[PDB]
Amino acid sequence: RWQGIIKQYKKYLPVDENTPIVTLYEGNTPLIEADNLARAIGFKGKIYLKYEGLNPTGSFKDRGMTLAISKAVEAGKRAVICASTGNTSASAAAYAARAGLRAYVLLPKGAVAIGKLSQAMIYGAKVLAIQGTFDDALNIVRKIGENFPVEIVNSVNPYRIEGQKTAAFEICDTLGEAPDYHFIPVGNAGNITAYWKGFKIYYEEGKITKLPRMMGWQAEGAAPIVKGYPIKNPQTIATAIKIGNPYSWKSALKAAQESGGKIDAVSDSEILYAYKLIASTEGVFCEPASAASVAGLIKLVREGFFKGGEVVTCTLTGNGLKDPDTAIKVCEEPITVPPDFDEVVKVLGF
Amino acid sequence: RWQGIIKQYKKYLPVDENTPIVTLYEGNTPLIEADNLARAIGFKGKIYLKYEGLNPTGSFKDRGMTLAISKAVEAGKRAVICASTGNTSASAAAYAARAGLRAYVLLPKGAVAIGKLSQAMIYGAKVLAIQGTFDDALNIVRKIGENFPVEIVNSVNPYRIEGQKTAAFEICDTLGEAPDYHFIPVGNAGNITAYWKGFKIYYEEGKITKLPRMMGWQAEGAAPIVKGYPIKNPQTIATAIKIGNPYSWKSALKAAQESGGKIDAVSDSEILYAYKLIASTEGVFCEPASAASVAGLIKLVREGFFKGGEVVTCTLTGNGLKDPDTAIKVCEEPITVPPDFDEVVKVLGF
Ligand SMILES: *Cc1c(COP(=O)(O)O)cnc(C)c1O
Ligand SMILES: *Cc1c(COP(=O)(O)O)cnc(C)c1O
């Protein structure tokens, strides 16, 4: 029986026999062999899609929060506090509810938008609209953590990356060896960092004989790592990776460098093409940001990057049900047809 | 290790060693012990939530579609077809894509509300807006199946209920025994029927020492099974159970009678309370219809139904990410607070 990532990989995590485990059975997500997709893009090798959208709150972030909240409970924290309007906030809230802890979200009145906060809110998170600026409100978040037993779960929390490395463990456990390449979307770059650390651990332990080349992918209008300098106003339909100054920038470059990989960019058009193709070839629905990994692969295929026979794994970071707006946006118009058998058959290719 | 429900429960299904298995790794969803929820509603026993929202397309229907589509391939069908605007169509489309088959959806141009078809469409379903009624489109779908190798995957397809019975197998496998009661939402009633069939099979094999009383739940504004007569214009915010003339009506009545349970109703207000409470006490986000099961449980606990010590399982049929509109609707607007630490702290109460 699957019982969460902490119980499965406890010997690799900063926990012990007394650490309280707050889990929603995250992890152990499908590693789907995508032969239809491979044929559709002309990739002469095996493609495996790690479908993280099936995690409890719809994002791989759950891997980090289970450990982060568990450690918080162990430390006697009475609540968690966040300053995010995305998957981070929803994930932290879910685990806080599971742990019986309070969850607080402080954001500037301007960054508030119910659509992006509904999930976190239903989890029980108390959202405050700070009548001020972004950094204005982060100061308040900081002051709370310094003065009260409230756990800050921003990027600064080291347990998030630690829990996230378990995705690499699962790929290696399932395949029996590491892939030749691992494709992953890159926003704040914590995930690519985590996977690399995960692969190195299994390698240092002798569980795998080779280390995958880490191929990270950013959206064109928000590719500070690819360019080498921060992006003031990052732009991209893939909200999850719309980051101008990634928190884990340094470790991400090290991961690409050590693994012999690279962090590159793809356009929103290429991202949407992959987003749709993944669903129409394999019946796997991920969110736009997740598709960047496959879009990256498609790009390299067309450029004649591969020699043939390589094994590639792609992280589909979030559930496509996370983004109903983009889903509706890419939908063509339903073809209108008269109530006539023969006409219908005519429209269809019969 | 998990490879889908067909491979896991092959001996219980109408398949042989030569049947092509089209799977998306559906099934084996978390059976979450909800102690926080139990304490929150005063239930003096054990509550387990079967979180079906984590299935590949967001609902338990994936269990039926994996078999239905696999059987269609085996039969040499070139496509699948239905006339649904809900989870049925999305599920069928995803499995058709996985199987490399085409998927067609015929619906009256009227009911066409894009948000409800976006998922089926991204999976590659070809949706036709028929300038007629539901009955006109239904006859065209029938004529298509009688004249072409296109598999009808609506309610009449027997494989859906067969694949769905695996949910009960999983519950019994995980617990090592059957629950005293099983709470489940009831729309067309195929799921309740499937679970009952599943429990009886394990009982007959001796894998369980008891048979669960089946407790089905409908929304009061659409409870034809409860009232005994079709509901011309069913109403409820829980769209997945907004069914006025359930296809498996007779089977549901039999399941309730034979198991010693019953099919009852709960108000939308009671459903929404459950929907929110499940999320805030456990960090589990299911869609409204799914919450009907817990709402039913809450109703009975308050009415003094239980005696204490009973084990109850609840099927949370769909992912909360399936219904963004209701999620936004139940959310209170964030509280506006000045950028003053003491004020913020005063608002939260530390
Ligand atoms: C957070 C998130 C990302 C970005 O992850 P990083 O570690 O910041 O690069 C990508 N996709 C989804 C769905 C996310 O939630
Ligand atoms: C189909 C569906 C139901 C109703 O299932 P029935 O077997 O028709 O009673 C309930 N919830 C969700 C999420 C569904 O997709």
XYZ file of C-alpha atoms and ligand atoms in Angstrom:
730
model
C 0.000 0.000 0.000
C 1.283 3.444 -0.949
C 1.520 5.644 2.144
C 3.106 8.900 1.011
C 6.631 9.898 0.039
C 8.038 10.328 3.561
C 7.276 6.766 4.641
C 8.594 5.417 1.330
C 11.880 7.350 1.335
C 12.324 8.176 5.012
C 15.962 7.066 5.067
C 16.700 9.793 2.499
C 14.879 12.549 4.400
C 15.567 14.638 7.540
C 13.104 12.752 9.736
C 13.239 10.022 12.371
C 11.056 7.549 14.264
C 9.394 10.424 16.159
C 8.717 12.836 13.281
C 4.950 13.337 12.829
C 3.998 12.376 9.267
C 1.336 14.539 7.622
C 0.678 12.917 4.279
C -2.036 12.968 1.629
C -0.572 9.960 -0.171
C 1.267 12.284 -2.557
C 3.850 10.807 -4.894
C 3.880 7.424 -6.637
C 2.375 9.196 -9.638
C 2.216 7.390 -13.006
C 5.362 7.196 -15.160
C 3.505 6.739 -18.467
C 5.248 5.313 -21.558
C 4.170 7.649 -24.357
C 4.607 5.692 -27.594
C 1.815 7.581 -29.387
C 3.476 10.903 -28.524
C 6.889 9.607 -29.578
C 5.453 8.546 -32.945
C 3.657 11.877 -33.291
C 6.869 13.882 -32.847
C 9.214 11.426 -34.562
C 11.286 10.630 -31.469
C 13.120 7.351 -32.093
C 13.411 6.268 -28.480
C 11.285 5.852 -25.371
C 9.425 8.720 -23.729
C 8.048 8.453 -20.176
C 5.733 11.108 -18.721
C 5.813 11.588 -14.927
C 2.209 12.756 -14.407
C 2.509 14.903 -11.240
C -0.919 16.370 -11.894
C -2.332 13.424 -9.974
C -0.850 14.605 -6.672
C -3.461 15.547 -3.960
C -3.705 19.272 -4.799
C -2.791 18.932 -8.474
C 0.896 19.894 -8.337
C 4.272 18.299 -7.579
C 4.543 20.965 -4.831
C 2.795 18.432 -2.592
C 6.094 16.533 -2.373
C 7.690 19.473 -0.639
C 4.753 20.458 1.537
C 4.279 17.036 3.091
C 7.819 17.299 4.479
C 7.592 21.023 5.193
C 4.368 20.730 7.221
C 5.458 17.519 8.913
C 8.649 19.230 10.067
C 6.580 22.243 11.140
C 4.380 20.061 13.352
C 7.505 18.424 14.730
C 8.800 21.886 15.630
C 5.543 22.741 17.391
C 4.424 25.349 14.860
C 0.778 26.347 15.213
C 0.247 27.481 11.643
C 1.918 28.047 8.280
C 2.099 31.358 6.469
C 2.432 32.017 2.773
C 2.654 34.977 0.383
C 1.777 33.095 -2.824
C -1.250 33.162 -5.126
C -0.463 29.908 -6.904
C 0.040 26.167 -6.458
C 2.342 26.787 -3.494
C -0.466 28.364 -1.475
C -3.011 25.668 -2.320
C -0.536 22.912 -1.452
C 0.547 24.463 1.867
C -3.097 24.982 2.858
C -4.081 21.376 2.129
C -1.272 20.020 4.282
C -1.995 22.542 7.023
C -5.632 21.372 7.098
C -4.464 17.759 7.172
C -2.145 18.586 10.080
C -4.853 20.474 11.952
C -2.876 23.700 11.623
C -4.031 27.143 10.526
C -2.892 28.552 7.184
C -2.413 32.247 6.479
C -1.923 33.937 3.121
C -0.767 37.571 3.092
C -0.835 39.321 -0.280
C -1.093 42.907 -1.541
C -4.654 43.966 -2.395
C -3.453 44.187 -5.989
C -2.283 40.574 -6.299
C -5.603 39.192 -5.063
C -7.765 37.319 -7.581
C -10.262 34.744 -6.277
C -9.777 32.348 -9.187
C -6.141 31.809 -8.222
C -6.968 31.555 -4.514
C -10.165 29.473 -4.417
C -8.479 26.118 -3.802
C -6.262 27.447 -1.026
C -9.312 29.105 0.475
C -11.522 26.030 0.448
C -8.668 24.211 2.213
C -9.313 26.740 4.996
C -6.539 29.279 4.327
C -7.250 32.752 5.666
C -6.365 35.275 2.974
C -5.579 38.881 3.851
C -5.594 41.696 1.309
C -2.751 43.917 2.502
C -3.486 47.483 1.416
C 0.114 47.928 0.324
C 2.927 46.713 -1.921
C 4.336 43.206 -2.399
C 7.527 43.757 -0.409
C 5.426 45.826 1.987
C 3.578 42.653 2.899
C 6.542 40.288 2.885
C 7.953 42.363 5.718
C 4.818 41.576 7.713
C 5.144 37.880 6.854
C 8.737 38.018 8.099
C 7.806 39.789 11.343
C 5.188 37.133 12.080
C 7.659 34.289 11.721
C 10.161 36.045 13.965
C 7.636 36.804 16.703
C 5.231 33.832 16.631
C 5.399 30.020 16.217
C 4.148 30.284 12.623
C 5.933 28.393 9.859
C 6.944 30.381 6.783
C 6.608 28.077 3.787
C 8.054 30.317 1.057
C 10.998 29.260 -1.128
C 13.282 29.860 1.858
C 12.000 26.627 3.415
C 14.649 23.947 2.624
C 12.309 20.997 3.152
C 10.446 21.749 -0.061
C 13.408 20.899 -2.276
C 14.198 17.904 -0.058
C 10.745 16.418 -0.458
C 10.715 17.143 -4.182
C 13.820 15.065 -4.879
C 11.648 11.983 -4.293
C 10.301 12.359 -7.829
C 13.723 11.361 -9.174
C 13.776 8.381 -6.800
C 10.475 7.139 -8.205
C 11.609 7.421 -11.815
C 14.759 5.453 -10.996
C 12.773 2.874 -8.978
C 10.264 2.336 -11.775
C 12.735 2.255 -14.692
C 15.395 0.318 -12.777
C 18.008 2.800 -14.042
C 18.262 6.518 -14.789
C 17.047 8.045 -18.102
C 19.520 9.489 -20.601
C 17.777 12.845 -20.264
C 15.226 14.405 -17.939
C 13.052 17.221 -19.295
C 11.504 19.597 -16.783
C 9.869 23.051 -16.723
C 11.855 25.711 -14.854
C 10.222 28.520 -12.881
C 11.966 29.250 -9.582
C 14.215 26.304 -10.480
C 13.674 24.457 -7.203
C 12.359 21.346 -8.964
C 15.219 20.870 -11.430
C 17.563 21.359 -8.457
C 15.641 18.740 -6.484
C 15.640 16.150 -9.274
C 19.381 16.557 -9.795
C 20.036 16.111 -6.080
C 17.790 13.053 -6.175
C 19.611 11.510 -9.113
C 23.013 12.165 -7.529
C 21.952 10.473 -4.289
C 20.855 7.301 -6.077
C 24.045 7.450 -8.144
C 26.319 7.929 -5.119
C 24.521 4.974 -3.576
C 25.026 2.845 -6.666
C 21.322 2.426 -7.421
C 21.876 3.884 -10.892
C 24.929 3.628 -13.166
C 24.527 6.861 -15.107
C 23.300 10.373 -14.385
C 20.631 11.900 -16.618
C 21.419 15.079 -18.503
C 19.110 17.708 -17.003
C 17.208 19.581 -19.695
C 15.314 22.476 -18.147
C 12.863 24.636 -20.088
C 11.636 28.201 -19.660
C 9.005 30.195 -21.518
C 10.525 32.652 -24.018
C 9.112 35.758 -22.345
C 10.308 34.631 -18.918
C 13.706 33.007 -19.430
C 16.103 34.855 -17.090
C 18.232 31.734 -16.625
C 18.539 31.182 -20.363
C 19.484 34.835 -20.893
C 21.709 35.238 -17.848
C 19.948 38.223 -16.276
C 16.642 38.961 -14.452
C 13.445 39.744 -16.357
C 11.608 42.712 -14.848
C 8.187 41.821 -16.244
C 8.154 38.114 -17.185
C 5.535 37.212 -19.782
C 3.989 33.835 -20.622
C 0.718 31.947 -20.732
C 2.362 29.274 -18.537
C 1.788 31.085 -15.234
C 3.574 28.432 -13.155
C 6.912 29.344 -14.777
C 6.335 33.087 -15.219
C 9.343 33.953 -13.033
C 11.774 36.819 -13.651
C 14.324 36.187 -10.903
C 14.273 32.488 -9.897
C 14.992 31.788 -6.238
C 17.074 28.669 -7.044
C 18.887 30.213 -10.033
C 22.385 29.250 -8.856
C 21.707 25.595 -8.025
C 19.784 25.181 -11.298
C 22.793 26.287 -13.355
C 24.944 23.898 -11.329
C 22.517 21.057 -12.048
C 22.662 21.694 -15.794
C 26.445 22.088 -15.665
C 27.184 18.982 -13.565
C 24.701 16.799 -15.455
C 25.912 17.949 -18.859
C 22.458 19.327 -19.518
C 21.142 22.799 -20.214
C 18.312 25.211 -19.421
C 16.757 26.579 -22.604
C 13.623 28.319 -23.836
C 10.563 27.596 -25.955
C 7.827 29.929 -27.170
C 4.281 30.002 -25.804
C 3.196 28.623 -29.196
C 5.512 25.646 -28.837
C 4.306 25.209 -25.252
C 0.634 25.204 -26.263
C 1.321 22.785 -29.129
C 2.864 20.323 -26.654
C 0.115 21.005 -24.099
C -2.470 19.901 -26.657
C -0.430 17.100 -28.232
C 0.198 15.375 -24.892
C -3.560 15.187 -24.359
C -4.513 14.133 -27.898
C -1.860 11.422 -28.181
C -1.878 9.963 -24.663
C -5.030 11.149 -22.898
C -2.884 12.917 -20.308
C -4.086 16.391 -19.319
C -1.424 18.644 -17.782
C -1.297 22.411 -17.338
C 0.589 24.718 -19.788
C 3.746 25.072 -17.667
C 4.054 21.281 -17.462
C 3.975 21.025 -21.266
C 7.179 23.084 -21.552
C 9.174 19.928 -20.870
C 7.703 18.108 -23.887
C 7.912 21.266 -25.985
C 11.610 21.331 -25.159
C 11.916 17.732 -26.327
C 10.056 18.468 -29.557
C 12.436 21.354 -30.212
C 15.525 19.192 -29.801
C 14.003 16.423 -31.928
C 13.419 18.791 -34.850
C 16.937 20.215 -34.494
C 18.311 16.692 -34.918
C 19.722 16.590 -31.376
C 19.176 12.868 -30.782
C 21.021 9.865 -32.207
C 18.316 7.291 -31.543
C 17.378 4.903 -28.765
C 17.716 7.401 -25.925
C 15.429 7.107 -22.903
C 13.790 10.367 -21.886
C 11.566 11.233 -18.925
C 9.454 14.383 -18.779
C 7.931 15.941 -15.691
C 4.337 17.042 -16.195
C 4.302 19.284 -13.116
C 0.590 20.099 -12.815
C -2.926 18.813 -13.484
C -4.534 20.376 -16.557
C -7.654 20.873 -14.438
C -5.643 23.583 -12.634
C -6.044 25.906 -15.649
C -9.619 25.987 -17.032
C -8.989 29.335 -18.731
C -6.247 28.108 -21.049
C -8.253 24.924 -21.699
C -11.180 27.000 -22.956
C -8.875 29.375 -24.849
C -7.324 26.632 -27.020
C -10.655 24.959 -27.787
C -11.775 25.223 -31.387
C -15.429 25.902 -32.159
C -17.927 22.993 -32.129
C -18.959 22.298 -35.735
C -22.673 22.983 -36.189
C -24.560 20.355 -38.199
C -28.224 19.626 -39.048
C -30.129 16.741 -37.341
C -29.484 14.385 -40.251
C -27.705 11.019 -40.080
C -26.214 11.265 -43.571
C -25.047 14.855 -43.051
C -23.461 13.975 -39.702
C -21.698 10.996 -41.267
C -20.616 13.432 -43.979
C -19.041 15.835 -41.481
C -17.237 12.964 -39.759
C -14.814 10.973 -41.901
C -17.067 7.972 -42.554
C 4.276 -1.342 -9.441
C 0.748 -0.024 -10.092
C -0.242 -0.792 -13.677
C -3.948 -0.006 -13.859
C -7.145 -1.704 -12.725
C -7.443 -4.260 -15.552
C -4.036 -5.818 -14.862
C -4.649 -5.718 -11.114
C -8.103 -7.331 -11.215
C -7.868 -9.251 -14.487
C -9.533 -12.432 -13.169
C -12.617 -10.432 -12.175
C -13.008 -8.855 -15.612
C -14.226 -9.945 -19.091
C -10.741 -10.012 -20.605
C -8.199 -12.663 -21.610
C -4.428 -12.763 -22.097
C -4.929 -11.419 -25.629
C -7.161 -8.451 -24.745
C -5.316 -5.181 -25.534
C -4.992 -3.186 -22.303
C -5.451 0.571 -22.724
C -4.681 2.045 -19.326
C -3.753 5.409 -17.858
C -2.792 3.902 -14.497
C -6.282 4.676 -13.162
C -7.352 3.231 -9.831
C -5.389 2.584 -6.652
C -6.486 6.025 -5.489
C -5.911 6.980 -1.828
C -8.208 5.617 0.879
C -7.693 8.453 3.374
C -8.539 7.911 7.037
C -10.274 11.144 7.983
C -9.841 11.530 11.749
C -10.074 15.344 11.615
C -13.350 15.088 9.689
C -14.728 12.470 12.088
C -13.899 14.659 15.073
C -15.380 17.661 13.278
C -18.794 16.015 12.776
C -18.766 13.953 15.962
C -18.630 10.545 14.284
C -17.579 8.000 16.914
C -15.913 5.662 14.455
C -13.581 5.472 11.487
C -14.158 7.375 8.268
C -12.232 6.598 5.081
C -12.395 8.788 2.003
C -11.759 7.064 -1.354
C -10.314 10.001 -3.302
C -11.317 9.182 -6.886
C -10.471 12.709 -7.978
C -6.910 11.599 -8.495
C -7.867 9.287 -11.372
C -6.279 10.225 -14.778
C -9.153 12.462 -15.978
C -10.482 13.580 -12.604
C -13.305 11.122 -11.910
C -13.993 7.457 -11.133
C -15.430 7.031 -14.622
C -11.873 6.264 -15.758
C -12.361 2.797 -14.219
C -15.153 2.046 -16.638
C -13.565 3.657 -19.666
C -10.307 1.722 -19.445
C -12.318 -1.504 -19.885
C -14.828 -0.074 -22.360
C -12.078 1.264 -24.615
C -9.858 -1.809 -24.262
C -12.830 -3.964 -25.250
C -13.550 -1.657 -28.175
C -9.993 -2.069 -29.487
C -10.259 -5.820 -29.052
C -13.449 -5.709 -31.121
C -11.654 -3.707 -33.797
C -13.727 -0.542 -33.362
C -12.096 2.509 -34.953
C -13.653 5.093 -32.659
C -15.926 5.742 -29.683
C -19.004 7.944 -29.531
C -21.387 9.386 -26.954
C -23.772 12.275 -26.360
C -22.558 13.521 -22.971
C -21.416 16.969 -21.857
C -19.807 15.774 -18.610
C -17.112 13.580 -17.073
C -18.227 10.654 -19.254
C -17.130 12.428 -22.430
C -13.788 13.589 -21.013
C -13.006 10.094 -19.713
C -13.954 8.398 -22.991
C -11.920 10.921 -24.974
C -8.763 10.414 -22.890
C -8.881 6.633 -23.269
C -9.693 6.903 -26.982
C -6.602 9.113 -27.386
C -4.474 6.618 -25.424
C -5.795 3.790 -27.639
C -5.069 5.761 -30.799
C -8.797 5.863 -31.559
C -11.011 8.762 -32.617
C -13.707 10.076 -30.258
C -16.949 11.720 -31.315
C -19.432 13.685 -29.254
C -22.860 14.612 -30.636
C -24.790 17.205 -28.626
C -27.637 19.685 -29.208
C -26.147 23.059 -30.166
C -28.066 24.423 -27.184
C -26.407 22.707 -24.208
C -22.981 23.618 -25.611
C -21.252 25.388 -22.696
C -17.575 25.298 -23.740
C -16.170 25.099 -20.207
C -17.855 21.710 -19.821
C -16.356 20.325 -23.032
C -12.844 21.789 -22.983
C -11.254 18.706 -21.408
C -12.866 16.222 -23.792
C -11.870 18.519 -26.636
C -8.216 18.842 -25.682
C -8.088 15.041 -25.525
C -9.049 15.299 -29.230
C -12.827 14.666 -29.143
C -14.659 15.958 -32.205
C -17.777 17.697 -30.899
C -20.663 18.381 -33.257
C -23.393 20.861 -32.390
C -26.564 19.343 -33.803
C -29.311 21.777 -34.796
C -31.858 19.650 -32.968
C -32.709 18.065 -29.612
C -30.985 15.528 -27.342
C -33.285 12.906 -28.812
C -32.291 13.779 -32.375
C -28.598 13.468 -31.545
C -29.217 10.241 -29.639
C -30.849 8.576 -32.657
C -27.949 9.681 -34.849
C -25.475 8.193 -32.381
C -27.420 4.927 -32.413
C -27.585 4.834 -36.226
C -23.839 5.449 -36.348
C -23.144 2.459 -34.124
C -25.409 0.156 -36.132
C -23.798 1.167 -39.418
C -20.121 1.684 -38.545
C -17.348 0.183 -36.338
C -17.807 2.991 -33.801
C -18.305 1.996 -30.167
C -21.105 3.665 -28.197
C -19.762 4.522 -24.755
C -22.852 5.984 -23.125
C -24.757 4.266 -20.285
C -25.721 1.218 -22.369
C -22.100 0.032 -22.537
C -21.895 -2.800 -19.917
C -18.140 -2.515 -19.433
C -18.331 0.785 -17.544
C -20.118 -0.678 -14.526
C -17.809 -3.727 -14.678
C -14.634 -1.672 -14.520
C -16.149 0.517 -11.815
C -16.637 -2.415 -9.422
C -12.853 -2.427 -8.926
C -13.252 0.543 -6.566
C -14.881 -1.769 -4.023
C -12.103 -4.354 -4.516
C -9.528 -1.706 -3.635
C -11.335 -0.617 -0.470
C -11.543 -4.223 0.733
C -7.900 -4.866 -0.226
C -6.650 -1.839 1.684
C -8.704 -2.347 4.845
C -8.480 -6.138 4.769
C -12.237 -6.201 5.365
C -15.424 -4.475 4.263
C -16.870 -1.289 5.851
C -20.144 -1.418 7.793
C -21.548 1.246 5.483
C -20.506 2.721 2.156
C -21.624 6.243 1.235
C -21.731 7.163 -2.444
C -23.291 9.891 -4.634
C -26.048 8.744 -7.007
C -26.654 10.234 -10.457
C -27.352 7.582 -13.047
C -26.685 5.055 -10.255
C -24.092 3.032 -12.169
C -21.472 3.473 -9.446
C -23.651 2.295 -6.542
C -24.587 -0.766 -8.621
C -20.929 -1.454 -9.442
C -19.754 -1.194 -5.811
C -22.483 -3.528 -4.578
C -21.519 -6.082 -7.247
C -17.905 -5.709 -6.179
C -18.553 -6.198 -2.478
C -20.719 -9.289 -3.096
C -17.949 -10.856 -5.193
C -15.334 -10.451 -2.454
C -17.787 -11.723 0.152
C -18.546 -14.815 -1.910
C -14.799 -15.409 -2.162
C -14.410 -14.923 1.574
C -12.054 -11.954 1.243
C -14.453 -10.063 3.508
C -16.627 -11.264 6.390
C -19.490 -8.833 5.899
C -21.490 -6.963 3.278
C -21.659 -3.152 3.547
C -25.050 -1.471 3.728
C -25.117 0.731 0.615
C -26.068 4.325 1.410
C -26.677 6.293 -1.776
C -27.243 10.039 -1.904
C -28.969 12.372 -4.332
C -29.463 16.139 -4.231
C -33.031 16.928 -3.103
C -33.658 18.962 -6.256
C -32.888 15.905 -8.374
C -33.804 12.782 -6.439
C -36.099 10.788 -8.743
C -35.016 7.508 -7.135
C -35.965 8.890 -3.728
C -39.369 10.159 -4.880
C -40.003 7.208 -7.202
C -40.692 9.273 -10.321
C -38.538 10.986 -12.980
C -37.695 14.651 -12.412
C -38.532 16.560 -15.601
C -36.194 19.439 -14.787
C -33.677 18.264 -12.154
C -31.867 20.974 -10.232
C -28.694 21.172 -8.135
C -25.290 22.769 -8.163
C -23.854 19.256 -8.007
C -23.922 18.819 -11.790
C -22.595 15.226 -11.888
C -25.726 14.025 -10.101
C -28.206 16.364 -11.787
C -30.002 13.383 -13.335
C -33.793 13.233 -13.603
C -34.240 9.721 -15.003
C -31.255 7.564 -13.900
C -30.195 4.858 -16.328
C -29.491 2.261 -13.599
C -32.524 3.153 -11.480
C -33.674 -0.441 -10.957
C -30.173 -1.693 -10.140
C -29.767 1.052 -7.510
C -33.055 0.139 -5.833
C -31.905 -3.481 -5.779
C -28.514 -2.547 -4.337
C -30.145 -0.637 -1.480
C -32.691 -3.386 -0.736
C -30.309 -6.336 -0.979
C -27.563 -4.719 1.090
C -29.898 -3.329 3.735
C -29.049 0.267 2.885
C -31.077 3.019 1.217
C -31.027 5.846 -1.297
C -31.757 9.225 0.286
C -31.305 12.923 -0.462
C -29.492 15.955 0.915
C -29.972 19.637 0.134
C -27.470 21.641 -1.892
C -26.762 23.535 1.325
C -25.830 20.313 3.080
C -23.722 19.249 0.093
C -21.828 22.550 -0.016
C -21.180 22.322 3.746
C -19.673 18.858 3.225
C -17.722 19.956 0.133
C -16.046 22.703 2.187
C -15.583 20.679 5.365
C -13.828 17.798 3.616
C -11.305 20.261 2.235
C -10.809 22.232 5.465
C -10.511 19.235 7.782
C -8.436 16.909 5.595
C -6.942 18.894 2.718
C -8.919 16.833 0.216
C -10.591 18.741 -2.625
C -13.472 16.936 -4.344
C -16.236 18.332 -6.558
C -19.748 19.124 -5.176
C -21.432 15.882 -6.275
C -18.681 13.914 -4.523
C -19.501 15.719 -1.283
C -23.014 14.265 -1.379
C -21.629 11.116 0.252
C -20.208 12.933 3.274
C -23.287 15.165 3.490
C -25.341 12.004 3.734
C -23.080 10.758 6.512
C -23.365 14.071 8.393
C -27.153 13.920 8.064
C -27.302 10.473 9.647
C -24.839 11.255 12.434
C -26.933 14.241 13.525
C -30.104 12.159 13.368
C -28.471 9.765 15.828
C -28.321 6.965 13.230
C -25.043 5.354 14.370
C -24.310 3.589 17.664
C -20.544 4.106 17.647
C -17.564 2.059 16.474
C -18.731 1.568 12.890
C -16.343 1.836 9.940
C -17.602 3.924 7.028
C -16.135 4.510 3.572
C -17.133 7.409 1.335
C -16.581 7.647 -2.404
C -15.337 11.106 -3.386
C -16.168 10.635 -7.076
C -14.449 13.645 -8.658
C -11.576 16.111 -8.389
C -12.471 19.526 -6.967
C -10.440 21.018 -9.820
C -13.253 19.817 -12.135
C -15.561 22.605 -10.885
C -13.776 25.988 -10.696
C -17.065 27.919 -10.831
C -18.449 26.485 -7.595
C -15.015 26.857 -5.963
C -15.049 30.578 -6.708
C -18.708 30.875 -5.727
C -18.254 29.541 -2.179
C -15.255 31.774 -1.446
C -15.645 34.847 0.738
C -13.737 37.918 -0.440
C -10.380 38.406 1.335
C -10.325 40.766 4.323
C -8.722 44.122 3.566
C -6.113 45.135 6.137
C -3.709 48.107 6.378
C 0.054 47.461 6.029
C 0.428 47.541 9.825
C 2.014 44.564 11.600
C 0.021 44.976 14.817
C -3.159 45.419 12.803
C -2.506 42.264 10.767
C -1.648 40.344 13.936
C -4.829 41.785 15.440
C -6.873 40.601 12.461
C -5.493 37.065 12.666
C -5.411 36.988 16.459
C -1.949 35.999 17.683
C 5.673 25.581 -9.197
C 5.372 24.947 -10.514
C 6.349 24.947 -11.583
C 7.705 25.601 -11.363
O 8.428 24.752 -10.460
P 9.887 25.361 -10.131
O 10.615 24.361 -9.126
O 9.710 26.683 -9.500
O 10.807 25.509 -11.443
C 6.010 24.335 -12.796
N 4.802 23.762 -12.957
C 3.861 23.735 -12.000
C 2.533 23.067 -12.272
C 4.105 24.324 -10.741
O 3.159 24.297 -9.768
C -20.732 10.271 -13.066
C -20.398 10.935 -11.771
C -21.275 10.789 -10.637
C -22.533 9.951 -10.792
O -22.093 8.588 -10.921
P -23.343 7.599 -11.123
O -22.787 6.108 -11.256
O -24.038 7.981 -12.364
O -24.365 7.674 -9.885
C -20.934 11.424 -9.436
N -19.799 12.161 -9.352
C -18.947 12.327 -10.379
C -17.706 13.166 -10.195
C -19.207 11.724 -11.629
O -18.355 11.885 -12.667
